[PDB]
Design a protein around this ligand. Structure first.
Ligand SMILES: *[C@@H]1O[C@H](CO)[C@@H](O)[C@H](O)[C@H]1NC(C)=O
Ligand SMILES: *[C@H]1O[C@H](CO)[C@@H](O)[C@H](O)[C@H]1NC(C)=O
Lengths: 25, 355
């Protein structure tokens, strides 16, 4: 209504997380 | 159509992508719901193959809708259910014994049984599958532990065989819950959290139904046809967050955001989108140009062509032209148009293959 600049940059990648380790054998 | 699997059979060169499923029947289910998969070749566990090659489920596509069958040890091959009139449930209520299904482990708690682990995965927003250590597991550090897991595709990245441990799948798809899929609708709002994918949608309610079926989408943002930037018009941004909720609501007009109801009313209504979009051209990869009488005929042509994902009937209209018009059968990778065009006099729609 006063100004529109395109400042939303579509960016496809994933959600981060805290690493958890697997079972060993 | 073929629902029975082909024992010791290996299809040859249709590789779209390769994902890992517990069994060949699940490999079929993944194929069935994949926008382009027509065929699959699953690699069961056998001494003739190296362990790394086990549970390989190869999604295949062919212009001829079939592929060379070579015979091969411990290979189960099969065809998708895209055409079939019988339906499936896509709900894997099975729990797999001595199977480590691997993905991004994000939670690690304790649970009385695998069924408690399952109920956790089912009720967790990010969980796709779980692995639970029975009480008899070598490592006392790990006994009775519940690892909640998620992957980009919703399927495991690698499955290995590990004794005294059970894997299983989230049962969100098993719910009934006729309730609004879009749940919270946020008009004149854009969200701004991790964009994990993007598709082109005709209206905002297709946008929502896609997010509900997308493995890793929890909320979305739809830019309308009157949105300022042309490249962003009809852009369906699928987003997620670690909380499961959006972070910030930016009030911008001509954009609608919303919340997936992940397990709402959505086995196959995004696939039953029998709506006709007039003055609307669904762009894509051209598969054929047949001629027919109506858009209702164009649709039936897309439904019966198993490789057809969407269509545009360009109506001839007998103003001064012939009565028969053109039926562009189309396709893309995501199953959605690559661009929706408004004002070029076409009647567009979606395949009813899986409806
Ligand atoms: C398996 O091998 C080929 C496919 O590679 C097939 O044509 C043939 O009928 C089968 N052979 C036998 C003897 O089962
Ligand atoms: C799992 O445990 C983690 C670590 O304490 C916790 O952050 C999360 O809320 C738990 N989630 C479930 C569903 O158990």
């Amino acid at each position: 209504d006063d100004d529109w600049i395109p400042d939303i940059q579509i960016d496809p990648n994933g959600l981060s997380f805290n690493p958890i380790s697997d079972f060993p054998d | 159509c073929v629902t029975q699997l082909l024992k010791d059979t290996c299809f040859e060169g249709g590789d779209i992508t390769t994902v890992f499923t517990p069994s060949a029947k699940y490999c079929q289910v993944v194929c069935t719901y994949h926008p382009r998969c027509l065929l699959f070749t699953f690699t069961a566990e056998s001494p003739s193959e190296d362990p790394t090659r086990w549970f390989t489920c190869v999604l295949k596509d062919s212009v001829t809708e079939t592929l060379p069958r070579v015979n091969r040890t411990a290979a189960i091959s099969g065809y998708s259910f895209k055409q079939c009139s019988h339906q499936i449930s896509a709900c894997n209520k099975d729990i797999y014994v001595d199977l480590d299904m691997k993905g991004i482990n994000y939670n690690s708690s304790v649970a009385k049984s695998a069924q408690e682990c399952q109920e956790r995965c089912t009720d967790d927003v990010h969980c796709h599958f779980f692995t639970y250590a029975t009480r008899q597991f070598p490592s006392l550090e790990h006994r009775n532990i519940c690892l909640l897991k998620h992957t980009q595709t919703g399927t495991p990245t690698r499955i290995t065989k590990l004794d005294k441990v059970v894997s299983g799948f989230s049962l969100k798809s098993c719910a009934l819950s006729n309730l609004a899929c879009i749940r919270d609708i946020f008009p004149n709002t854009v969200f701004a959290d991790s964009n994990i994918d993007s598709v082109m949608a005709p209206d905002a309610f297709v946008c929502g139904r896609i997010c509900t079926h997308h493995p890793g989408c929890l909320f979305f943002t739809f830019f309308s046809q009157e949105w300022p930037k042309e490249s962003q018009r009809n852009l369906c941004l699928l987003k997620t967050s670690e909380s499961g909720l959006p972070s910030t609501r930016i009030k911008k007009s001509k954009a609608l955001s919303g919340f997936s109801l992940q397990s709402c009313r959505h086995s196959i209504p995004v696939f039953c989108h029998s709506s006709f979009y007039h003055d609307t051209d669904f762009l894509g990869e051209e598969l054929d140009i047949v001629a027919a009488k109506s858009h209702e005929a164009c649709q039936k042509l897309c439904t019966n062509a198993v490789r057809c994902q969407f269509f545009t009937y360009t109506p001839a209209q007998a103003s001064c032209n012939e009565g028969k018009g053109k039926c562009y059968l189309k396709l893309s990778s995501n199953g959605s148009p690559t661009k929706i065009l408004h004002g070029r006099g076409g009647i567009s729609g979606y395949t009813l293959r899986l409806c």
